Amino acid sequence: MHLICQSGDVLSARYEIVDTLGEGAFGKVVECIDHKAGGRHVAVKIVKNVDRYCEAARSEIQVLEHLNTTDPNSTFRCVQMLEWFEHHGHICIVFELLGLSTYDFIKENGFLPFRLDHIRKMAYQICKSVNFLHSNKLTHTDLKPENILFVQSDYTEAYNKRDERTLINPDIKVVDFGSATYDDEHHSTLVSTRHYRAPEVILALGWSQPCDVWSIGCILIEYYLGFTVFPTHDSKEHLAMMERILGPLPKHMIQKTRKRKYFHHDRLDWDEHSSAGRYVSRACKPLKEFMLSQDVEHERLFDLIQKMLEYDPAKRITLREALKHPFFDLLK
Ligand SMILES: CCOC(=O)c1c(/C(C#N)=C\N)c2ccc(Cl)c(Cl)c2n1C
């Protein structure tokens, strides 16, 4: 990868690398001048020449071809692919250029949270975008702040606690369709590492579009706080955190699951006095205690978040319903 993505490199006799925009598991995204499109700047996703990742890239290209034909005006804010090609055996996907991810923005802003008015706008766009995927028999599966990109991330700075950066325009798009799965496709029952895994994913109960809703609830809490309420990679710890924040797992889900490794009799097999246990007790608390204000717009936000973090994926709010929530009435 190091060998093919340096500034000044030309890809496909067309795209001149001017900068690296980011790095992920899949490889790297670079900013290029498109010399056959009048010098337009584009993003180019450079994928690792590794089976797993090439496969995911071919899949993302098929999804994006479908989405971009279905929504040619990008009314629903999914990243627009321009074309793709191969370069020294690596799959390269060309995208309209976007700005900094929401994750990166929070990081470069000292983990300061977004202002509620910006959260409302961003939440609405993310809901409408992902609802579009849901309407086309797709599940994203990997929604997280790192996969939500600002269209343009210019900001202003002012003293508040501390100095803060505030977006001038908080418009976003949804990116990374390398994990997106169609309804009639084989669903990975092993879901791999994810920022925010839904309980039905952890418990191998089956997953579909509701698992996106769960992730979006988690995104919204992270936007409001500046940090995730589930600071863990471990699946049992994650369940332990869920119980602290959201209450006990429903009996009916515990009864159904084959993941008996997490359970002992009817209850989570969790030692509250272990290292991980003590940390969970410190780091997690009931959802609504995370509120920074009791003001009604905060209550509106937290009501939506709680609905998105409903354990049972059948009962969980759909995006179509979330779009009609009171939190969004100010945008009407
Ligand atoms: C995990 C880091 O990925 C990115 O840095 C990233 C990514 C990806 C992917 N795939 C995910 N965050 C981008 C997708 C489309 C566009 Cl237009 C841009 Cl600019 C993208 N960037 C910068």
PDB file of all heavy atoms in Angstrom, residues 141-143 189-204 210-212 214-215 218 230 232-236 238-239 242 259 262 309 311 316, unseen atoms left out:
ATOM      1  N   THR A 141     -24.948  -1.792   7.992  1.00  0.00           N
ATOM      2  CA  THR A 141     -24.272  -2.660   8.987  1.00  0.00           C
ATOM      3  C   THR A 141     -23.081  -2.022   9.712  1.00  0.00           C
ATOM      4  O   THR A 141     -22.638  -2.554  10.710  1.00  0.00           O
ATOM      5  CB  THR A 141     -23.854  -4.061   8.485  1.00  0.00           C
ATOM      6  OG1 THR A 141     -22.621  -3.947   7.772  1.00  0.00           O
ATOM      7  CG2 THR A 141     -24.946  -4.746   7.623  1.00  0.00           C
ATOM      8  N   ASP A 142     -22.565  -0.886   9.232  1.00  0.00           N
ATOM      9  CA  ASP A 142     -21.333  -0.327   9.760  1.00  0.00           C
ATOM     10  C   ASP A 142     -21.446   1.181   9.928  1.00  0.00           C
ATOM     11  O   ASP A 142     -20.527   1.937   9.651  1.00  0.00           O
ATOM     12  CB  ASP A 142     -20.174  -0.728   8.841  1.00  0.00           C
ATOM     13  CG  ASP A 142     -18.789  -0.461   9.457  1.00  0.00           C
ATOM     14  OD1 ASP A 142     -18.649  -0.425  10.695  1.00  0.00           O
ATOM     15  OD2 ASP A 142     -17.834  -0.269   8.657  1.00  0.00           O
ATOM     16  N   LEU A 143     -22.607   1.630  10.414  1.00  0.00           N
ATOM     17  CA  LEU A 143     -22.799   3.017  10.719  1.00  0.00           C
ATOM     18  C   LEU A 143     -22.058   3.386  12.010  1.00  0.00           C
ATOM     19  O   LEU A 143     -22.202   2.751  13.085  1.00  0.00           O
ATOM     20  CB  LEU A 143     -24.293   3.375  10.810  1.00  0.00           C
ATOM     21  CG  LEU A 143     -25.101   3.128   9.518  1.00  0.00           C
ATOM     22  CD1 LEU A 143     -26.629   3.122   9.827  1.00  0.00           C
ATOM     23  CD2 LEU A 143     -24.712   4.193   8.440  1.00  0.00           C
ATOM     24  N   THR A 189     -23.482 -13.952   9.803  1.00  0.00           N
ATOM     25  CA  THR A 189     -24.011 -14.251  11.154  1.00  0.00           C
ATOM     26  C   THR A 189     -22.923 -14.009  12.197  1.00  0.00           C
ATOM     27  O   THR A 189     -23.203 -13.655  13.350  1.00  0.00           O
ATOM     28  CB  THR A 189     -24.509 -15.710  11.274  1.00  0.00           C
ATOM     29  N   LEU A 190     -21.682 -14.249  11.789  1.00  0.00           N
ATOM     30  CA  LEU A 190     -20.544 -13.603  12.414  1.00  0.00           C
ATOM     31  C   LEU A 190     -20.492 -12.199  11.825  1.00  0.00           C
ATOM     32  O   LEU A 190     -20.181 -12.038  10.652  1.00  0.00           O
ATOM     33  CB  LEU A 190     -19.240 -14.352  12.114  1.00  0.00           C
ATOM     34  N   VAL A 191     -20.867 -11.199  12.618  1.00  0.00           N
ATOM     35  CA  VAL A 191     -20.506  -9.815  12.322  1.00  0.00           C
ATOM     36  C   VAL A 191     -19.137  -9.577  12.979  1.00  0.00           C
ATOM     37  O   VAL A 191     -18.874 -10.029  14.095  1.00  0.00           O
ATOM     38  CB  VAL A 191     -21.526  -8.799  12.868  1.00  0.00           C
ATOM     39  N   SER A 192     -18.249  -8.884  12.289  1.00  0.00           N
ATOM     40  CA  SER A 192     -16.919  -8.642  12.834  1.00  0.00           C
ATOM     41  C   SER A 192     -16.921  -7.422  13.792  1.00  0.00           C
ATOM     42  O   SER A 192     -17.999  -6.975  14.255  1.00  0.00           O
ATOM     43  CB  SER A 192     -15.952  -8.460  11.671  1.00  0.00           C
ATOM     44  OG  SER A 192     -16.471  -7.488  10.786  1.00  0.00           O
ATOM     45  N   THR A 193     -15.722  -6.916  14.112  1.00  0.00           N
ATOM     46  CA  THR A 193     -15.564  -5.711  14.923  1.00  0.00           C
ATOM     47  C   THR A 193     -16.441  -4.586  14.389  1.00  0.00           C
ATOM     48  O   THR A 193     -16.497  -4.329  13.179  1.00  0.00           O
ATOM     49  CB  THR A 193     -14.133  -5.187  14.873  1.00  0.00           C
ATOM     50  OG1 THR A 193     -13.255  -6.262  15.212  1.00  0.00           O
ATOM     51  CG2 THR A 193     -13.963  -3.985  15.808  1.00  0.00           C
ATOM     52  N   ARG A 194     -17.124  -3.932  15.317  1.00  0.00           N
ATOM     53  CA  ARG A 194     -17.909  -2.769  15.015  1.00  0.00           C
ATOM     54  C   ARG A 194     -17.975  -1.893  16.235  1.00  0.00           C
ATOM     55  O   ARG A 194     -18.035  -2.383  17.375  1.00  0.00           O
ATOM     56  CB  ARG A 194     -19.304  -3.173  14.553  1.00  0.00           C
ATOM     57  CG  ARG A 194     -19.458  -3.173  13.038  1.00  0.00           C
ATOM     58  CD  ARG A 194     -20.308  -4.307  12.630  1.00  0.00           C
ATOM     59  NE  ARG A 194     -20.620  -4.363  11.208  1.00  0.00           N
ATOM     60  CZ  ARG A 194     -19.783  -4.800  10.267  1.00  0.00           C
ATOM     61  NH1 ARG A 194     -18.549  -5.183  10.573  1.00  0.00           N
ATOM     62  NH2 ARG A 194     -20.189  -4.872   9.004  1.00  0.00           N
ATOM     63  N   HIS A 195     -17.927  -0.588  15.963  1.00  0.00           N
ATOM     64  CA  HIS A 195     -18.033   0.465  16.962  1.00  0.00           C
ATOM     65  C   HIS A 195     -19.227   0.184  17.891  1.00  0.00           C
ATOM     66  O   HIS A 195     -19.097   0.187  19.111  1.00  0.00           O
ATOM     67  CB  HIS A 195     -18.205   1.819  16.224  1.00  0.00           C
ATOM     68  CG  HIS A 195     -17.924   3.028  17.063  1.00  0.00           C
ATOM     69  ND1 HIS A 195     -16.966   3.047  18.061  1.00  0.00           N
ATOM     70  CD2 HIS A 195     -18.438   4.281  17.009  1.00  0.00           C
ATOM     71  CE1 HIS A 195     -16.939   4.248  18.613  1.00  0.00           C
ATOM     72  NE2 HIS A 195     -17.819   5.015  17.991  1.00  0.00           N
ATOM     73  N   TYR A 196     -20.366  -0.079  17.251  1.00  0.00           N
ATOM     74  CA  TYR A 196     -21.636  -0.268  17.854  1.00  0.00           C
ATOM     75  C   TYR A 196     -22.399  -1.471  17.252  1.00  0.00           C
ATOM     76  O   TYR A 196     -23.195  -1.307  16.307  1.00  0.00           O
ATOM     77  CB  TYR A 196     -22.567   0.894  17.564  1.00  0.00           C
ATOM     78  CG  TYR A 196     -22.096   2.298  17.728  1.00  0.00           C
ATOM     79  CD1 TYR A 196     -22.208   3.171  16.653  1.00  0.00           C
ATOM     80  CD2 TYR A 196     -21.654   2.806  18.958  1.00  0.00           C
ATOM     81  CE1 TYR A 196     -21.845   4.474  16.750  1.00  0.00           C
ATOM     82  CE2 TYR A 196     -21.267   4.171  19.062  1.00  0.00           C
ATOM     83  CZ  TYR A 196     -21.389   4.984  17.932  1.00  0.00           C
ATOM     84  OH  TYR A 196     -21.071   6.327  17.914  1.00  0.00           O
ATOM     85  N   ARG A 197     -22.273  -2.613  17.866  1.00  0.00           N
ATOM     86  CA  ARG A 197     -23.081  -3.790  17.509  1.00  0.00           C
ATOM     87  C   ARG A 197     -24.414  -3.855  18.284  1.00  0.00           C
ATOM     88  O   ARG A 197     -24.448  -3.763  19.507  1.00  0.00           O
ATOM     89  CB  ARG A 197     -22.304  -5.078  17.772  1.00  0.00           C
ATOM     90  CG  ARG A 197     -21.384  -5.545  16.630  1.00  0.00           C
ATOM     91  CD  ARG A 197     -19.956  -5.783  17.152  1.00  0.00           C
ATOM     92  NE  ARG A 197     -19.351  -7.021  16.676  1.00  0.00           N
ATOM     93  CZ  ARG A 197     -19.715  -8.236  17.093  1.00  0.00           C
ATOM     94  NH1 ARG A 197     -20.679  -8.399  17.991  1.00  0.00           N
ATOM     95  NH2 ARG A 197     -19.103  -9.305  16.609  1.00  0.00           N
ATOM     96  N   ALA A 198     -25.488  -4.076  17.537  1.00  0.00           N
ATOM     97  CA  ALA A 198     -26.803  -4.293  18.122  1.00  0.00           C
ATOM     98  C   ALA A 198     -26.840  -5.617  18.887  1.00  0.00           C
ATOM     99  O   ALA A 198     -26.099  -6.547  18.559  1.00  0.00           O
ATOM    100  CB  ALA A 198     -27.874  -4.268  17.025  1.00  0.00           C
ATOM    101  N   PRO A 199     -27.741  -5.710  19.884  1.00  0.00           N
ATOM    102  CA  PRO A 199     -27.872  -6.906  20.719  1.00  0.00           C
ATOM    103  C   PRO A 199     -28.197  -8.166  19.914  1.00  0.00           C
ATOM    104  O   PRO A 199     -27.676  -9.256  20.231  1.00  0.00           O
ATOM    105  CB  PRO A 199     -28.967  -6.537  21.733  1.00  0.00           C
ATOM    106  CG  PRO A 199     -29.634  -5.315  21.225  1.00  0.00           C
ATOM    107  CD  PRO A 199     -28.721  -4.653  20.244  1.00  0.00           C
ATOM    108  N   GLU A 200     -29.045  -8.050  18.895  1.00  0.00           N
ATOM    109  CA  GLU A 200     -29.372  -9.191  18.037  1.00  0.00           C
ATOM    110  C   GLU A 200     -28.152  -9.679  17.227  1.00  0.00           C
ATOM    111  O   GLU A 200     -28.098 -10.835  16.821  1.00  0.00           O
ATOM    112  CB  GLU A 200     -30.585  -8.886  17.114  1.00  0.00           C
ATOM    113  CG  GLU A 200     -30.379  -7.810  16.057  1.00  0.00           C
ATOM    114  CD  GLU A 200     -30.609  -6.371  16.522  1.00  0.00           C
ATOM    115  OE1 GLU A 200     -30.629  -6.118  17.754  1.00  0.00           O
ATOM    116  OE2 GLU A 200     -30.753  -5.496  15.623  1.00  0.00           O
ATOM    117  N   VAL A 201     -27.184  -8.795  16.990  1.00  0.00           N
ATOM    118  CA  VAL A 201     -25.955  -9.188  16.306  1.00  0.00           C
ATOM    119  C   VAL A 201     -25.084  -9.963  17.284  1.00  0.00           C
ATOM    120  O   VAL A 201     -24.661 -11.082  16.998  1.00  0.00           O
ATOM    121  CB  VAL A 201     -25.169  -7.979  15.738  1.00  0.00           C
ATOM    122  CG1 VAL A 201     -23.846  -8.467  15.109  1.00  0.00           C
ATOM    123  CG2 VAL A 201     -26.029  -7.232  14.714  1.00  0.00           C
ATOM    124  N   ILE A 202     -24.892  -9.405  18.469  1.00  0.00           N
ATOM    125  CA  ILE A 202     -24.128 -10.061  19.519  1.00  0.00           C
ATOM    126  C   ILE A 202     -24.711 -11.454  19.819  1.00  0.00           C
ATOM    127  O   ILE A 202     -23.980 -12.414  19.985  1.00  0.00           O
ATOM    128  CB  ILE A 202     -24.103  -9.224  20.834  1.00  0.00           C
ATOM    129  CG1 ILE A 202     -23.410  -7.862  20.631  1.00  0.00           C
ATOM    130  CG2 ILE A 202     -23.445 -10.053  21.996  1.00  0.00           C
ATOM    131  CD1 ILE A 202     -23.433  -7.001  21.868  1.00  0.00           C
ATOM    132  N   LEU A 203     -26.035 -11.552  19.872  1.00  0.00           N
ATOM    133  CA  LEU A 203     -26.717 -12.784  20.289  1.00  0.00           C
ATOM    134  C   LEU A 203     -27.069 -13.734  19.133  1.00  0.00           C
ATOM    135  O   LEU A 203     -27.675 -14.806  19.357  1.00  0.00           O
ATOM    136  CB  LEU A 203     -27.956 -12.437  21.109  1.00  0.00           C
ATOM    137  CG  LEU A 203     -27.735 -11.670  22.423  1.00  0.00           C
ATOM    138  CD1 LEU A 203     -29.074 -11.367  23.058  1.00  0.00           C
ATOM    139  CD2 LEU A 203     -26.814 -12.428  23.393  1.00  0.00           C
ATOM    140  N   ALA A 204     -26.669 -13.345  17.920  1.00  0.00           N
ATOM    141  CA  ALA A 204     -26.790 -14.172  16.721  1.00  0.00           C
ATOM    142  C   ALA A 204     -28.254 -14.564  16.510  1.00  0.00           C
ATOM    143  O   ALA A 204     -28.572 -15.701  16.166  1.00  0.00           O
ATOM    144  CB  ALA A 204     -25.867 -15.409  16.832  1.00  0.00           C
ATOM    145  N   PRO A 210     -33.129  -3.132  11.289  1.00  0.00           N
ATOM    146  CA  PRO A 210     -33.077  -2.585  12.680  1.00  0.00           C
ATOM    147  C   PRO A 210     -31.673  -2.465  13.261  1.00  0.00           C
ATOM    148  O   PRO A 210     -31.452  -1.605  14.110  1.00  0.00           O
ATOM    149  CB  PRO A 210     -33.981  -3.525  13.469  1.00  0.00           C
ATOM    150  CG  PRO A 210     -34.933  -4.009  12.468  1.00  0.00           C
ATOM    151  CD  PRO A 210     -34.093  -4.242  11.216  1.00  0.00           C
ATOM    152  N   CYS A 211     -30.723  -3.275  12.816  1.00  0.00           N
ATOM    153  CA  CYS A 211     -29.380  -3.126  13.415  1.00  0.00           C
ATOM    154  C   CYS A 211     -28.744  -1.742  13.056  1.00  0.00           C
ATOM    155  O   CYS A 211     -27.949  -1.201  13.822  1.00  0.00           O
ATOM    156  CB  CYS A 211     -28.496  -4.329  13.112  1.00  0.00           C
ATOM    157  SG  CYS A 211     -27.746  -4.374  11.460  1.00  0.00           S
ATOM    158  N   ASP A 212     -29.167  -1.154  11.938  1.00  0.00           N
ATOM    159  CA  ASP A 212     -28.751   0.198  11.524  1.00  0.00           C
ATOM    160  C   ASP A 212     -29.309   1.242  12.458  1.00  0.00           C
ATOM    161  O   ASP A 212     -28.631   2.203  12.801  1.00  0.00           O
ATOM    162  CB  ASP A 212     -29.181   0.515  10.106  1.00  0.00           C
ATOM    163  CG  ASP A 212     -28.286  -0.083   9.063  1.00  0.00           C
ATOM    164  OD1 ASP A 212     -27.154  -0.488   9.399  1.00  0.00           O
ATOM    165  OD2 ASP A 212     -28.717  -0.042   7.898  1.00  0.00           O
ATOM    166  N   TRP A 214     -30.123   0.845  15.636  1.00  0.00           N
ATOM    167  CA  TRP A 214     -29.354   0.743  16.866  1.00  0.00           C
ATOM    168  C   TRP A 214     -28.074   1.579  16.752  1.00  0.00           C
ATOM    169  O   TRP A 214     -27.773   2.388  17.591  1.00  0.00           O
ATOM    170  CB  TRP A 214     -28.993  -0.716  17.129  1.00  0.00           C
ATOM    171  CG  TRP A 214     -28.125  -0.850  18.337  1.00  0.00           C
ATOM    172  CD1 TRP A 214     -26.743  -0.755  18.404  1.00  0.00           C
ATOM    173  CD2 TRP A 214     -28.586  -1.034  19.663  1.00  0.00           C
ATOM    174  NE1 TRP A 214     -26.329  -0.903  19.706  1.00  0.00           N
ATOM    175  CE2 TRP A 214     -27.436  -1.092  20.501  1.00  0.00           C
ATOM    176  CE3 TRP A 214     -29.860  -1.219  20.235  1.00  0.00           C
ATOM    177  CZ2 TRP A 214     -27.534  -1.272  21.876  1.00  0.00           C
ATOM    178  CZ3 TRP A 214     -29.946  -1.428  21.611  1.00  0.00           C
ATOM    179  CH2 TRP A 214     -28.793  -1.451  22.411  1.00  0.00           C
ATOM    180  N   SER A 215     -27.323   1.356  15.690  1.00  0.00           N
ATOM    181  CA  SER A 215     -26.097   2.103  15.444  1.00  0.00           C
ATOM    182  C   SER A 215     -26.316   3.599  15.398  1.00  0.00           C
ATOM    183  O   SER A 215     -25.508   4.377  15.961  1.00  0.00           O
ATOM    184  CB  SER A 215     -25.473   1.618  14.127  1.00  0.00           C
ATOM    185  OG  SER A 215     -25.104   0.248  14.174  1.00  0.00           O
ATOM    186  N   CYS A 218     -26.677   5.092  18.860  1.00  0.00           N
ATOM    187  CA  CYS A 218     -25.356   5.171  19.431  1.00  0.00           C
ATOM    188  C   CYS A 218     -24.540   6.362  18.877  1.00  0.00           C
ATOM    189  O   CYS A 218     -23.897   7.096  19.656  1.00  0.00           O
ATOM    190  CB  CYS A 218     -24.608   3.877  19.129  1.00  0.00           C
ATOM    191  SG  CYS A 218     -25.214   2.412  19.969  1.00  0.00           S
ATOM    192  N   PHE A 230     -20.449   3.172  24.877  1.00  0.00           N
ATOM    193  CA  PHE A 230     -20.010   1.768  24.926  1.00  0.00           C
ATOM    194  C   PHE A 230     -18.527   1.640  24.603  1.00  0.00           C
ATOM    195  O   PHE A 230     -18.161   1.061  23.580  1.00  0.00           O
ATOM    196  CB  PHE A 230     -20.813   0.920  23.937  1.00  0.00           C
ATOM    197  CG  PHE A 230     -22.272   0.902  24.216  1.00  0.00           C
ATOM    198  CD1 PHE A 230     -23.170   1.476  23.338  1.00  0.00           C
ATOM    199  CD2 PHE A 230     -22.764   0.266  25.347  1.00  0.00           C
ATOM    200  CE1 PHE A 230     -24.535   1.452  23.602  1.00  0.00           C
ATOM    201  CE2 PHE A 230     -24.107   0.224  25.620  1.00  0.00           C
ATOM    202  CZ  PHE A 230     -25.011   0.801  24.739  1.00  0.00           C
ATOM    203  N   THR A 232     -15.818  -0.193  24.532  1.00  0.00           N
ATOM    204  CA  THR A 232     -15.370  -1.579  24.644  1.00  0.00           C
ATOM    205  C   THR A 232     -15.301  -2.245  23.278  1.00  0.00           C
ATOM    206  O   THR A 232     -16.041  -1.878  22.363  1.00  0.00           O
ATOM    207  CB  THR A 232     -16.336  -2.417  25.534  1.00  0.00           C
ATOM    208  OG1 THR A 232     -15.737  -3.687  25.841  1.00  0.00           O
ATOM    209  CG2 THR A 232     -17.667  -2.632  24.844  1.00  0.00           C
ATOM    210  N   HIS A 233     -14.411  -3.223  23.164  1.00  0.00           N
ATOM    211  CA  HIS A 233     -14.339  -4.118  22.009  1.00  0.00           C
ATOM    212  C   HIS A 233     -14.949  -5.506  22.321  1.00  0.00           C
ATOM    213  O   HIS A 233     -15.316  -6.248  21.398  1.00  0.00           O
ATOM    214  CB  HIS A 233     -12.880  -4.298  21.584  1.00  0.00           C
ATOM    215  N   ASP A 234     -15.053  -5.847  23.608  1.00  0.00           N
ATOM    216  CA  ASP A 234     -15.434  -7.200  24.042  1.00  0.00           C
ATOM    217  C   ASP A 234     -16.954  -7.357  24.096  1.00  0.00           C
ATOM    218  O   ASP A 234     -17.643  -6.527  24.703  1.00  0.00           O
ATOM    219  CB  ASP A 234     -14.850  -7.502  25.416  1.00  0.00           C
ATOM    220  CG  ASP A 234     -15.262  -8.874  25.933  1.00  0.00           C
ATOM    221  OD1 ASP A 234     -14.825  -9.881  25.343  1.00  0.00           O
ATOM    222  OD2 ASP A 234     -16.044  -8.949  26.903  1.00  0.00           O
ATOM    223  N   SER A 235     -17.462  -8.435  23.491  1.00  0.00           N
ATOM    224  CA  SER A 235     -18.904  -8.623  23.337  1.00  0.00           C
ATOM    225  C   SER A 235     -19.661  -8.795  24.659  1.00  0.00           C
ATOM    226  O   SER A 235     -20.771  -8.301  24.785  1.00  0.00           O
ATOM    227  CB  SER A 235     -19.234  -9.789  22.378  1.00  0.00           C
ATOM    228  OG  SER A 235     -19.510  -9.303  21.070  1.00  0.00           O
ATOM    229  N   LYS A 236     -19.083  -9.503  25.631  1.00  0.00           N
ATOM    230  CA  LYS A 236     -19.766  -9.706  26.908  1.00  0.00           C
ATOM    231  C   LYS A 236     -19.771  -8.409  27.720  1.00  0.00           C
ATOM    232  O   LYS A 236     -20.747  -8.078  28.378  1.00  0.00           O
ATOM    233  CB  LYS A 236     -19.134 -10.864  27.695  1.00  0.00           C
ATOM    234  CG  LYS A 236     -19.908 -11.270  28.937  1.00  0.00           C
ATOM    235  CD  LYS A 236     -19.359 -12.581  29.550  1.00  0.00           C
ATOM    236  N   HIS A 238     -19.782  -5.518  26.372  1.00  0.00           N
ATOM    237  CA  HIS A 238     -20.746  -4.714  25.666  1.00  0.00           C
ATOM    238  C   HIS A 238     -22.159  -4.965  26.183  1.00  0.00           C
ATOM    239  O   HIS A 238     -22.910  -4.029  26.477  1.00  0.00           O
ATOM    240  CB  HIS A 238     -20.654  -5.040  24.182  1.00  0.00           C
ATOM    241  CG  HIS A 238     -21.138  -3.949  23.298  1.00  0.00           C
ATOM    242  ND1 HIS A 238     -20.544  -3.658  22.094  1.00  0.00           N
ATOM    243  CD2 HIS A 238     -22.170  -3.085  23.436  1.00  0.00           C
ATOM    244  CE1 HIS A 238     -21.198  -2.662  21.522  1.00  0.00           C
ATOM    245  NE2 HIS A 238     -22.196  -2.304  22.312  1.00  0.00           N
ATOM    246  N   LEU A 239     -22.509  -6.244  26.344  1.00  0.00           N
ATOM    247  CA  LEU A 239     -23.781  -6.598  26.934  1.00  0.00           C
ATOM    248  C   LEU A 239     -23.925  -6.096  28.356  1.00  0.00           C
ATOM    249  O   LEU A 239     -25.010  -5.652  28.759  1.00  0.00           O
ATOM    250  CB  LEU A 239     -23.997  -8.100  26.856  1.00  0.00           C
ATOM    251  CG  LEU A 239     -24.122  -8.721  25.464  1.00  0.00           C
ATOM    252  CD1 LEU A 239     -24.056 -10.273  25.598  1.00  0.00           C
ATOM    253  CD2 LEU A 239     -25.434  -8.261  24.742  1.00  0.00           C
ATOM    254  N   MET A 242     -24.711  -2.483  28.129  1.00  0.00           N
ATOM    255  CA  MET A 242     -26.113  -2.343  27.762  1.00  0.00           C
ATOM    256  C   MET A 242     -27.028  -2.437  28.968  1.00  0.00           C
ATOM    257  O   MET A 242     -27.910  -1.596  29.127  1.00  0.00           O
ATOM    258  CB  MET A 242     -26.534  -3.354  26.688  1.00  0.00           C
ATOM    259  CG  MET A 242     -25.857  -3.187  25.351  1.00  0.00           C
ATOM    260  SD  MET A 242     -26.442  -4.416  24.169  1.00  0.00           S
ATOM    261  CE  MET A 242     -25.340  -4.232  22.821  1.00  0.00           C
ATOM    262  N   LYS A 259     -25.955 -18.182  21.946  1.00  0.00           N
ATOM    263  CA  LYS A 259     -24.732 -17.645  22.530  1.00  0.00           C
ATOM    264  C   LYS A 259     -24.795 -17.830  24.045  1.00  0.00           C
ATOM    265  O   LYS A 259     -24.908 -16.875  24.829  1.00  0.00           O
ATOM    266  CB  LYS A 259     -24.572 -16.171  22.145  1.00  0.00           C
ATOM    267  CG  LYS A 259     -24.377 -15.951  20.666  1.00  0.00           C
ATOM    268  CD  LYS A 259     -22.991 -16.384  20.234  1.00  0.00           C
ATOM    269  CE  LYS A 259     -22.707 -15.970  18.801  1.00  0.00           C
ATOM    270  NZ  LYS A 259     -21.274 -16.171  18.446  1.00  0.00           N
ATOM    271  N   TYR A 262     -22.397 -16.268  27.024  1.00  0.00           N
ATOM    272  CA  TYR A 262     -22.605 -14.979  27.701  1.00  0.00           C
ATOM    273  C   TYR A 262     -23.504 -15.135  28.910  1.00  0.00           C
ATOM    274  O   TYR A 262     -23.640 -14.190  29.690  1.00  0.00           O
ATOM    275  CB  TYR A 262     -23.239 -13.942  26.745  1.00  0.00           C
ATOM    276  CG  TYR A 262     -22.406 -13.646  25.535  1.00  0.00           C
ATOM    277  CD1 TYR A 262     -22.969 -13.664  24.266  1.00  0.00           C
ATOM    278  CD2 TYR A 262     -21.053 -13.324  25.646  1.00  0.00           C
ATOM    279  CE1 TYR A 262     -22.218 -13.403  23.143  1.00  0.00           C
ATOM    280  CE2 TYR A 262     -20.290 -13.050  24.517  1.00  0.00           C
ATOM    281  CZ  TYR A 262     -20.885 -13.103  23.263  1.00  0.00           C
ATOM    282  OH  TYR A 262     -20.165 -12.843  22.116  1.00  0.00           O
ATOM    283  N   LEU A 309     -32.571   2.560  20.763  1.00  0.00           N
ATOM    284  CA  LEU A 309     -31.867   1.564  21.586  1.00  0.00           C
ATOM    285  C   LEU A 309     -32.794   0.567  22.303  1.00  0.00           C
ATOM    286  O   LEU A 309     -32.411  -0.038  23.306  1.00  0.00           O
ATOM    287  CB  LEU A 309     -30.943   2.275  22.595  1.00  0.00           C
ATOM    288  CG  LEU A 309     -29.866   3.183  21.989  1.00  0.00           C
ATOM    289  CD1 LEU A 309     -28.885   3.695  23.055  1.00  0.00           C
ATOM    290  CD2 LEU A 309     -29.148   2.529  20.849  1.00  0.00           C
ATOM    291  N   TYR A 311     -34.210  -2.972  22.837  1.00  0.00           N
ATOM    292  CA  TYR A 311     -33.463  -4.215  22.673  1.00  0.00           C
ATOM    293  C   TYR A 311     -34.031  -5.079  21.526  1.00  0.00           C
ATOM    294  O   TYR A 311     -33.282  -5.649  20.712  1.00  0.00           O
ATOM    295  CB  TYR A 311     -33.489  -5.009  23.975  1.00  0.00           C
ATOM    296  CG  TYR A 311     -32.463  -4.613  25.033  1.00  0.00           C
ATOM    297  CD1 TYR A 311     -32.867  -4.194  26.292  1.00  0.00           C
ATOM    298  CD2 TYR A 311     -31.111  -4.770  24.812  1.00  0.00           C
ATOM    299  CE1 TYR A 311     -31.943  -3.890  27.284  1.00  0.00           C
ATOM    300  CE2 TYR A 311     -30.183  -4.471  25.807  1.00  0.00           C
ATOM    301  CZ  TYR A 311     -30.610  -4.037  27.028  1.00  0.00           C
ATOM    302  OH  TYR A 311     -29.671  -3.736  28.002  1.00  0.00           O
ATOM    303  N   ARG A 316     -38.208  -2.114  17.963  1.00  0.00           N
ATOM    304  CA  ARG A 316     -37.422  -0.933  17.741  1.00  0.00           C
ATOM    305  C   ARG A 316     -38.051  -0.067  16.636  1.00  0.00           C
ATOM    306  O   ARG A 316     -38.559  -0.567  15.625  1.00  0.00           O
ATOM    307  CB  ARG A 316     -35.987  -1.337  17.340  1.00  0.00           C
ATOM    308  CG  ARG A 316     -34.919  -0.239  17.374  1.00  0.00           C
ATOM    309  CD  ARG A 316     -33.576  -0.832  17.060  1.00  0.00           C
ATOM    310  NE  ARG A 316     -33.179  -1.853  18.034  1.00  0.00           N
ATOM    311  CZ  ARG A 316     -32.482  -2.949  17.718  1.00  0.00           C
ATOM    312  NH1 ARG A 316     -31.983  -3.106  16.505  1.00  0.00           N
ATOM    313  NH2 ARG A 316     -32.192  -3.846  18.636  1.00  0.00           N
TER     314      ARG A 316
END
